[PDB]
Design a protein around this nucleic acid. Structure first.
Ligand code: CL
Ligand code: CL
Ligand code: K
Ligand code: MG
Ligand code: MG
Ligand code: MG
Ligand code: MG
Ligand code: MG
Ligand code: MG
Ligand code: MG
Ligand code: MG
Ligand code: MG
Ligand code: MG
Ligand code: NA
Ligand code: NA
Ligand code: NA
Ligand code: NA
Ligand code: NA
Ligand code: NA
Ligand code: NA
Ligand code: NA
Ligand code: NA
Ligand code: NA
Ligand code: NA
Lengths: 81, 194, 65, 56, 46, 119
RNA sequence: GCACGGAGGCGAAGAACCAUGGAUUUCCGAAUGAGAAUCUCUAACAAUUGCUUCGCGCAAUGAGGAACCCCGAGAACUGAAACAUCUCAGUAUCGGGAGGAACAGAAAACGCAAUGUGAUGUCGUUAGUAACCGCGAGUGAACGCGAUACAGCCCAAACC
RNA sequence: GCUUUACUGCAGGCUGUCGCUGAG
């Protein structure tokens, strides 16, 4: 069975969202909905997801911009992996 | 003594006389309102059905099929043709109506296989035939020594390949001698000349 | 390699699922490091992590979990 | 108006497209029928004996 | 135009097939991309 | 219907079927059109029954005249499964024949008489 | 792996490799819950059938395959030094369908007429013979014989 | 390709007959 999260989409823009808006960006399975992305992220990193934006990239994969709650620190979550 | 069956048979030797005559005059009225293929609980001619392999048993089915009377329904040529091939009105098909009926029935019951068929009359514009079909997958038949032959894989779609009795006579295979030079073993192996 | 078939067959249905999740995670993080261009790789592992996960799922199948 | 070059300018309509069944760019999206494999018209795959020499 | 999810995936794929043979493959075989499609000089499906 | 040339009153049919039941327990009965036919042909038939709800009618059409030229008495019965049940069958029967009644010969004889009069 | 790089890894816990068997096996596809250019919308044998506990409960069909095979539909160029019947040809092509082979098959046969043969295919021959035909051009068997292989049976009905 | 009271045919239309079709 397919998994929701593939890997962290780490790029300059991705960093900016992390340092400035507390967002983590992931490469997810395009069959995955925002809700499924939200859960997976919470269950894998023990955090609370506030908002999820998606995009079906020209790389054939789906990209998700997941925003964390004030309680969580994107920089710190991303930094442990 | 005479079997009761011999009376059904005997009546159908003259479908235009006596009781059978009045019966037909009545039935066709209902038949003309039925479909092209109507499954029926009982053969209109028991003696005939049973004579052809019928049996009051699970997996044995009967269906009356209606087919139009006459020559081929043909479209006139739309390109060059020598006189010989410009015909339309007098052209008749090489498959007899009874065979057409047997095919329409089998298609209606994709899982069944045609066993045989017989005529049950006609009016001025159509002929009716009753077709006996068999369920090759029902154990009632698979365990019947007089019918399980029709269960074999090589009997699949037997009607569409002319393996039916009507199919074989129509193929000119009745005679074992003179006249069947171009029919047996098959019309095709003989270059389609019969 | 590091994880053989016997060791996998000796585990309990619950130890497999646990061992499974662990591997998946090791893998996910391996891929995350790769995505970040993290050179501290070891091509053999990220590859063995896939086979290890295959062997486990294979055994969970044979065993009935 | 010339039937040549000048009439080629109006050609921005999409008809034949990648077919879901055979993969050929022959699925007519207006007719919803593949000119290559017959998809949308026939359950059986489109094929003709004239696609090759008679004795072959 | 308006591309669907599937079309987009196909375009994405074509763009990737449009990459060059990695330098290492040249060394690994001791020595062309027979599928170099240009957006202008070439035409894609659909 | 085409073979039915006279109507048998319900009450008569009742007595008739009743007689047939005792006939099978006391004397002997023939169940089935083929077996009924041979009775009429072999003359060993005392009384024969014929259902009116037979389809196709061919199965029975002959019973009437065949009986008439054999001097065998026959009676009609609306239902088909009643005749079969009354004959002792778990199924219906298009025709039945009382091959020598029993403890009902008087009744049978009378039933026959009633029908003759019923023409 | 082809594929001879770089880094790294696996193998005596016997890897690679090979054989058999098993696991996994996305989406579209006969494609079957419904729709759709391989995606989507809210439990599905869709459709047609058989049996039927009359409930999709138990089953069947659908599509493919190099050609071969069987059943239907059926040209024209061409030849005849024109051309119409004839010929090309029951060919090309089209519709339907089976199998590993099909089809045929145990005489209402043959008819070297017999005091004779003895299911059926096929091969060799009979023979370009008999037969057809603007009796033109053309067309064209069979019985028998020598072989191959061999195998004969089941119903309906009578009487139960 | 086209034409027509060219040759030969083929659709189509009209008309008789048979079947469907029966009572006085
Ligand atoms: Cl069939
Ligand atoms: Cl001889
Ligand atoms: K010609
Ligand atoms: Mg969006
Ligand atoms: Mg053959
Ligand atoms: Mg033009
Ligand atoms: Mg690029
Ligand atoms: Mg679907
Ligand atoms: Mg010529
Ligand atoms: Mg001449
Ligand atoms: Mg010829
Ligand atoms: Mg001969
Ligand atoms: Mg027997
Ligand atoms: Na990726
Ligand atoms: Na069928
Ligand atoms: Na012929
Ligand atoms: Na272009
Ligand atoms: Na596989
Ligand atoms: Na099914
Ligand atoms: Na059902
Ligand atoms: Na010439
Ligand atoms: Na000429
Ligand atoms: Na001629
Ligand atoms: Na001789």
């Amino acid at each position: 069975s397919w998994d929701v999260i593939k890997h962290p989409h780490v790029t300059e823009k991705a960093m900016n969202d992390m340092d400035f808006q507390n967002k983590l960006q992931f490469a997810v399975d395009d069959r995955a909905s925002k809700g499924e992305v939200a859960d997976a992220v919470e269950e894998q990193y023990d955090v609370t997801v506030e908002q999820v934006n998606t995009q079906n990239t020209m790389d054939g994969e789906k990209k998700a911009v997941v925003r964390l709650s004030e309680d969580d620190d994107a920089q710190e979550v991303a930094s442990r992996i | 003594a005479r079997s009761a069956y011999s009376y059904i048979r005997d009546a159908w030797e003259n479908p235009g006389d006596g009781q059978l005559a009045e019966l037909q005059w009545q039935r066709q009225q209902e038949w003309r309102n039925e479909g092209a293929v109507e499954r029926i609980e009982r053969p209109t001619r028991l003696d005939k059905a049973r004579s052809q392999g019928y049996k009051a048993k699970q997996g044995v089915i009967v269906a009356r099929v209606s087919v139009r009377k006459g020559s081929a329904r043909k479209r006139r040529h739309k390109a060059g043709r020598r006189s010989k091939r410009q015909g339309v009105t007098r052209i008749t098909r090489r498959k007899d109506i009874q065979r057409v009926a047997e095919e329409r029935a089998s298609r209606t019951f994709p899982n069944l296989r045609v066993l045989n068929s017989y005529s049950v009359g006609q009016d001025g514009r159509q002929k009716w035939h009753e077709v006996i079909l068999i369920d090759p997958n029902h154990p009632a038949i698979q365990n019947d020594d007089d019918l399980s032959w029709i269960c074999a894989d090589d009997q699949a779609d037997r009607v569409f390949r002319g393996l039916t009795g009507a199919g074989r006579r129509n193929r000119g295979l009745s005679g074992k001698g003179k006249g069947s030079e171009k029919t047996r073993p098959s019309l095709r192996s003989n270059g389609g000349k019969a | 390699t590091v994880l053989h078939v016997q060791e996998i067959r000796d585990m309990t249905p619950a130890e497999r699922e646990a061992e499974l999740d662990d591997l998946k995670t090791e893998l996910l993080n391996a891929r995350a490091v790769q995505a970040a261009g993290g050179a501290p790789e070891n091509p053999g592992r990220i590859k063995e992590l896939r086979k290890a996960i295959a062997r486990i799922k294979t055994i969970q199948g044979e065993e009935g979990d | 108006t010339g039937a040549g070059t000048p009439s080629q300018g109006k050609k921005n309509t999409t008809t034949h497209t990648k077919c879901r069944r055979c993969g050929e760019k022959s699925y007519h999206t207006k007719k919803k029928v593949c000119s290559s494999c017959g998809f949308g018209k026939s359950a059986k795959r489109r094929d003709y004996e004239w696609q090759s020499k008679a004795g072959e | 135009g308006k591309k669907s999810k599937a079309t987009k995936k196909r375009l994405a794929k074509l763009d990737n097939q449009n990459s060059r043979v990695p330098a290492w493959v040249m060394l690994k075989t001791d020595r062309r991309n027979h599928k170099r499609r240009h957006w202008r000089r070439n035409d894609t499906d659909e | 219907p085409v073979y039915v040339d006279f109507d048998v009153p319900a009450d008569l049919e009742d007595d008739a079927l009743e007689a047939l039941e005792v006939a099978r327990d006391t004397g002997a009965v023939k169940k089935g059109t083929n077996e009924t036919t041979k009775s009429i042909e072999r003359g060993s038939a005392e009384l024969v029954f014929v259902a009116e709800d037979v389809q196709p009618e061919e199965i029975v059409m002959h019973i009437p005249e065949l009986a008439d030229e054999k001097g065998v008495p026959f009676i009609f019965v609306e239902q088909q499964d009643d005749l079969g049940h009354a004959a002792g069958l778990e199924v219906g029967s298009a025709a039945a024949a009382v091959t020598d009644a029993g403890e009902a010969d008087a009744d049978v004889e009378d039933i026959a008489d009633k029908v003759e009069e019923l023409r």
